[PDB]
Amino acid sequence: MWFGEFGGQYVPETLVGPLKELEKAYKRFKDDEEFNRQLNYYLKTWAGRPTPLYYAKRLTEKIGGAKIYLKREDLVHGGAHKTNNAIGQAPLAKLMGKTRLIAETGAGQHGVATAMAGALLGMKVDIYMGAEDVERQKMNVFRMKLLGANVIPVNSGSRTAKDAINEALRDWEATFEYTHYLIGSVVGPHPYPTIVRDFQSVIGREAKAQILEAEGQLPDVIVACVGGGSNAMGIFYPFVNDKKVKLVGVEAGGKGLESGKHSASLNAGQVGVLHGMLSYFLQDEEGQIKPSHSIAPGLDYPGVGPEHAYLKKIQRAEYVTVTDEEALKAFHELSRTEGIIPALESAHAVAYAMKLAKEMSRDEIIIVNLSGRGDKDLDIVLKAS
């Protein structure tokens, strides 16, 4: 339910029953040998796991400090870690007797991921997306449609990722009998933050085995970008009890924390209740939710997962910010130095890892979670350059 004080389940009474059925179903299937055999089979033959752990030799040399390794989630089918969670949840939903998946999306990768999983499993897919956001990203929208999903434009409120979630909740409240709400990050009411973290934990489990094989030791630091926080929790979680391993989450500093135009919920947000959870959210002078911004569409959500709020509070993980410009520089840097075009979200982690590596020893090890590939971001980087 809770991670310290954070998380919980603060929802209308109509959602309590559906959320309890989800908890029970998850508890039933999470360690079920057949459910996991089937999931691992899809992850292997369909999604292409395991993804490699790549030693970025040129980048490491150029920075002259710590060894920089990249966990290559950019190679997962669909081009992002989102698939790990989509193909975890969709078969669970099907086993619960659901025939329909709904989901929120902003960067469109979770929409695509959900559309892919739904196509694969023969389930109807309706994707809620802000009416401003659908015009912002025509590529992923067309991908979703090609996959057989329906993209519902949201014309209410600020018409963005936050309001896509708002519409999805109303839909789910009416349709939960046959509809699974496939949430795309470690946010929302219990049990979603736990479920999504569990399905993303494969990243960390692979990375740990891979770094022990490659270097014979655990890393000194793990760096991952944090929007809602799923890719970060995915790679963090299996190292949480390894006291030696520093965990650093990188939020979108946007145009600078002083500008207001950013998405640094942990660094500059306030604790509060939204979308069924207690966590950090960006808030105005009055105390109401405030719009966020980032050059990276996937980091443009005003809140953050409760397990990160918890890790911040107990000082198990450190959270930092990287600006639009620094992410853009890192995007170009990785492309030119390693031949890997990263997602703009992932570029935030790379940007911070580059600063961090500089002040560390050559014997030390950083693993950066490369949460996705940058093919989706080409028009954005073109305009920005």
Ligand X SMILES: Cc1ncc(COP(=O)(O)O)c(/C=N/[C@H](C(=O)O)[C@@H](O)C(C)C)c1O
Burial class from Cβ neighbours inside 10 Å (0-12, 13-18, 19+) for residue 113 reads: buried
- The encoded tokens of residue 234 equal 């995915």
Burial class from Cβ neighbours inside 10 Å (0-12, 13-18, 19+) for residue 352 reads: buried
Interface mask toward a copy of itself for 136-155; x: CB under 8 A: ---x--xx--xxx-------
- In angstroms, what is the minimal distance from the CB of 356 to ligand X? 19
Q: How many angstroms separate the CA atoms of 320 and 349, rounded?
A: 10
Toward ligand X, which CB reaches closer, 65 or 74? 74
Figure out which of the listed residues 80, 107, 117, 357 binds a copy of itself, where binding follows CB under 8 A: 117
User: Considering Cα of 161, then 164, then 165, then 166, what sign does the dihedral take?
Assistant: positive
Task: Please give the residue ranges that form the binding site for ligand X (CB under 6 A).
Answer: 80, 82, 104-111, 161, 184-185, 225-232, 297-299, 301, 343, 345-346, 371-372
Q: Parallel, antiparallel, or unpaired: how do β-strands 67-72 and 100-104 relate?
A: unpaired
Q: How many angstroms separate the CA atoms of 64 and 26, rounded?
A: 46
Toward a copy of itself, which CB reaches closer, 121 or 360? 121
Please identify, among the stretches 173-181, 255-263, 330-338, 372-380, the one whose residues bind Na ion according to the rule CB under 5 A.
255-263
Binding of residue 55 to a copy of itself (CB under 8 A): yes
- In angstroms, what is the minimal distance from the CB of 108 to ligand X? 5
- In angstroms, what is the minimal distance from the CB of 347 to ligand X? 10
Binding-site residue total for Na ion (CB under 5 A)? 4
- In angstroms, what is the minimal distance from the CB of 231 to ligand X? 3
The catalytically annotated residue of 71, 82, 98, 208 is 82
Binding of residue 84 to a copy of itself (CB under 8 A): no
In 10 A of CB 327, how many CB atoms? 30
User: DSSP states of 235-276 as a string?
Assistant: HHGGGTT-TT-EEEEEEEEET-GGGS-S--HHHH-EEEEETT
Q: Report the greatest alpha carbon distance in the chain.
A: 57
Catalytic site includes residue 371: yes
Residues that bind a copy of itself (CB under 8 A): 44-46, 48, 51-55, 58, 72, 74-75, 77, 79, 115-120, 122, 139, 142-143, 146-148, 331-332, 335-341, 374-375, 378, 381-382
* Residues carrying an active site annotation: 82, 104, 371
